[PDB]
Amino acid sequence: FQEEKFTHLHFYFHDIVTGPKPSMVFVAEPNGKVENALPFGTVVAMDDPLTAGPERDSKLVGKAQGIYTSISQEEMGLMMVMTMAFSDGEFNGSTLSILGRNMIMSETIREMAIVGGTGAFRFVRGYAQAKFFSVDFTTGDATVEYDIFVFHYKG
Amino acid sequence: FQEEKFTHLHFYFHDIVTGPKPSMVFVAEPNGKVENALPFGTVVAMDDPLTAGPERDSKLVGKAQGIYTSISQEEMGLMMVMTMAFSDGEFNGSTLSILGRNMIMSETIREMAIVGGTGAFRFVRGYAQAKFFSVDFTTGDATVEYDIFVFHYKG
Amino acid sequence: FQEEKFTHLHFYFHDIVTGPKPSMVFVAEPNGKVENALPFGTVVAMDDPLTAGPERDSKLVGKAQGIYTSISQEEMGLMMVMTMAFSDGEFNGSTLSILGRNMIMSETIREMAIVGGTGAFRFVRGYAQAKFFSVDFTTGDATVEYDIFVFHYKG
């Protein structure tokens, strides 16, 4: 391929459901609630911290902001529609966009396309691989390890 | 163009509204219901079978999973935000992403960009053409013929 | 880069909240209403005119159709999930897709990736820059200047 730059991004995504300041909010629950899962059709909006380490209080490097939707009638699976926006590193203000299926119950390493980027990631080509560091299905709290491989151009 | 592989995909998308196990669910209906249409602002989540033939019981080849939104005040038109995920063929586990307008009342052949892909379709370039095989606007039941033309790389 | 065509698009986006025929509708308001802002998790569907000039009654060149979501807990910021569809110009029926963060309170020039296109914009590569012409946060009425730079191919 012809891109001028390659970058490996590695960080941890936190969906914080419990506690006094959750990172998300239910947008729609057309099938109500069920224990340990999000019923088909549930939509959640997220403002989720991205950190350098698995720990919530490790260095904040960005936010994953968007919505996820429960899109499977047979198991819990999510559609992620979101940006990853970076704020304390080598591409402050730059973003990556994701529109990807996320089969959190049946795939251990989950691939999502990078469908766009801005700033340093204008015209980006790339992909993301997500895997759990920790998940509690009774509450929804999750810490998700991301590796993103992006090919892009001079800023 | 420079891609190493080309694939023509051809299948049928089923939005099943009637019957004992619909494939979709209303997420939001801010303008209620109207006969034979989805009012502006309506959002539906889908877990829609993709089959090799027009018949519902023909070979299941994947699922179209995501949301569609009624986005026109003047006619019924949809925005599709979804993945197509393939499960019984040459690219099991691979997906394609669509973020496209879908003017089901005023275009007979409807083009939607492939905005991303995974697995076999990592780094994909392509487009989809959709046209009705059958539609019942009084219920919403629809069978939609898809041709997708994708350019991609070795797995 | 290798594209055969380049096009500079310039137009004005109107989100019309006040008046007898708003261009949008609230889809979900999980955190209710607040003065001068859209609370985190709010989703709006839009059928927004695109015009050649800042004036609402200047030449209609297309529609921006999709949803925007309030995705920040700390300031008002939007995720745009939408198509721009053109109707009275050099690419009638063609569309561009956007999946981008839109930090309307903290960035004066806001970049969004073009994540796909159709028709004349099949296989497009490009980006959008948005900046206010006018905004009234007490009502939500906004006129937004867009420049879009797209690289594409013969039709």
Author numbering:
A (entry chain A), B (entry chain A), C (entry chain A): 36 to 190
From the article:
Described herein are the 3D structures of two stereoselective pterocarpan-forming DPs from pea and licorice, which preferentially produce either (+)- or (–)-medicarpin, depending on the substrate. We describe that pterocarpan synthases, containing dirigent-like domains, initially engender mono-QM formation from their chiral substrates, this being followed by intramolecular cyclization (C–O bond formation) to afford entry into the pterocarpan natural product (phytoalexin) class. GePTS1 and PsPTS1, in solution, exist mainly as trimers (∼68.0 kDa), with (because of association/aggregation) a small amount of higher-molecular weight entities also being evident (roughly corresponding to 410–500 kDa).
The P. sativum “Cam_eor” Unigene set was searched using GePTS1 as query, which resulted in a gene (PsCam039127) being selected as possibly encoding a medicarpin-forming DP. Trivially named PsPTS1, it has ∼92%/85% sequence similarity/identity to GePTS1 at the amino acid level. In our hands, PsPTS1 displayed much lower (∼7-fold) catalytic turnover (kcat/Km) relative to GePTS1, this in part being due to the ∼6-fold increase in Km. The pea medicarpin-forming DP, PsPTS1, structure was solved by single-wavelength anomalous diffraction methods using the signal from intrinsic sulfur atoms (sulfur-SAD (single anomalous diffraction)) in the 11 methionine residues (excluding the N-terminal methionine). Its structure was refined against 1.5 Å resolution native data to a final Rfree of 0.1907. A trimeric complex is formed by the crystallographic 3-fold axis parallel to the body diagonal of the cubic unit cell, this being in agreement with the GPC.
